[PDB]
Structure 1
Amino acid sequence: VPLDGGRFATSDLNDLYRRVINRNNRLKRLLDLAAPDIIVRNEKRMLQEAVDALLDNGRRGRAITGSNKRPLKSLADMIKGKQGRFRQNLLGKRVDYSGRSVITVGPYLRLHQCGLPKKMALELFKPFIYGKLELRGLATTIKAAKKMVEREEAVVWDILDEVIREHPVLLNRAPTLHRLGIQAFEPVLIEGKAIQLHPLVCAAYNADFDGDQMAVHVPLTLEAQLEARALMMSTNNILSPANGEPIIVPS
């Protein structure tokens, strides 16, 4: 692919394929030319070296260093490592309708609520706004609905308030050591950029407000909403699954 700078950027697999093809074609040539056997042999060694580098580089001894000095990333290297494809792209992923910000106390909240910044929530529930806007006939189409949100018009806030009602949001803190590291709350729209967390659940998250942050995630489907409200809600996860004693307690 072309970078913006006019330059190109490519996978190392291209360098390894080019190695293999060059040496293979040169071998075809030296066979057409009836070359003496010492030279044919050298080319057959080099061909096996190139294929072995292409499949799994570094296993057959000294890995082939490209441009920096770093060994070229081979096929097996894209599967194998923790970084491969299994651990990185398949057993966990980056996710839409996800946000984060610093957390701060909400002592006024009840146990099942959390302060969610206005601008953050505007963005996370964008399709849900577009949807209600068209059912009220306030927006003629989606692009007009988008421009009404861009302009952050006063009627849009009222619609957004209506969508967030009874809609649960997942709060997550790193690291997620046990299941209570994710909990569902009913959000409360708040002016300001910080997420407000109920004190009593700070225990499960191991949340202390000296700059910790949290991920927000929006359960989209009816099923996901129900699993959040019934199974993952703060109120419903009072006792530790580890021992009988509850985690959500005053301190």
Structure 2
Amino acid sequence: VTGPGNRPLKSLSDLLKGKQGRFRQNLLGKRVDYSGRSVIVVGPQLKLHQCGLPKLMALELFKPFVMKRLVDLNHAQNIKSAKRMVERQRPQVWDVLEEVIAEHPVLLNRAPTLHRLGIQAFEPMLVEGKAIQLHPLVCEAFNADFDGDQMAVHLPLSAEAQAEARILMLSSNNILSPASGRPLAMPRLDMVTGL
């Protein structure tokens, strides 16, 4: 049965079938909160367990944490005032921001996620600019280059999720390929040429 433009009408069965159906599109995978995306750039000054989070992105990601620490310290009268201050990007938040960022891991992902190394945990450090800084040694696992690639940031909230990030999924804890045991966080082309 066709509607306007000879287009078949989506039936009750279509809702379940296909990649667009409920199973593939809403149950085996979903859109999540406390998450962002940006273009990656190489940061060689980074350590294997570190990554560069743009300041605006980190502020939005950690917004309620920043508000709570902004009311703990007397910068904010109440929580609505803290919300208004974080929204207006007031100068006081940034000192607070780096405080709530310390040792709170984030998850970096680059699609297509071919193996589990396609998602790795990093410690974020605030970076000036709007680009994520990615360690040059994790590019083999992500199959990442800097021809325009983008990556996604997910923020674990629960204590168990933070623990799984710091222990299981931490960048510096997964150096070897889970497929062949060979090193992936290995010196690549430029570093090779140099050595």
Q: TM > 0.5 between the two?
A: yes
Give the TM-score normalised by structure 2: 0.94
Aligned partner of 2:49 in structure 1 is: 112
Question: Identical aligned pairs, as a percentage?
Answer: 74
The letter of the residue matching 1:136 is L
Matches within 5 A, 1:181-196: 181-196=118-133
Matches within 5 A, 1:1-251: 64-251=1-188
Indicate conservation of the 8 Å contact 2:107/2:155, yes or no.
Answer: yes
SS in 2 for 1:78: coil
Residue 228 of structure 1 deviates from its aligned partner by 0.2
Residue 140 of structure 1 deviates from its aligned partner by 2.3
Residue 150 of structure 1 deviates from its aligned partner by 2.0
The letter of the residue matching 1:213 is Q
Indicate conservation of the 8 Å contact 2:55/2:129, yes or no.
Answer: yes
The letter of the residue matching 1:109 is L
The letter of the residue matching 1:146 is K
Deviations, residues 208-238 of structure 1 (Å, cap 9, x unaligned): 1110000010011111011000000000011
Q: Where do 5+ consecutive residues of structure 2 fail to align?
A: 189-195
Give the TM-score normalised by structure 1: 0.73
SS in 2 for 1:184: strand
Aligned partner of 2:193 in structure 1 is: none
Residue 82 of structure 1 deviates from its aligned partner by 2.1
Deviations, residues 16-55 of structure 1 (Å, cap 9, x unaligned): xxxxxxxxxxxxxxxxxxxxxxxxxxxxxxxxxxxxxxxx
- Whichever structure has more helix as a proportion of its residues is 1
Cα-Cα RMSD: 0.9
Greater Rg by CA = 1
In 1, Cα distance between the equivalents of 2:13 and 2:78? 48
Higher relative contact order (CA 8 A, sep 6+): 2
In 2, Cα distance between the equivalents of 1:109 and 1:164? 16
In 2, Cα distance between the equivalents of 1:85 and 1:236? 36
Q: Where do 5+ consecutive residues of structure 1 fail to align?
A: 1-63
The letter of the residue matching 2:121 is A
In 2, Cα distance between the equivalents of 1:240 and 1:212? 22
Deviations, residues 104-128 of structure 1 (Å, cap 9, x unaligned): 1100001000011001100000011
Aligned partner of 1:51 in structure 2 is: none
Deviations, residues 138-170 of structure 1 (Å, cap 9, x unaligned): 222222111111221222101111000001000
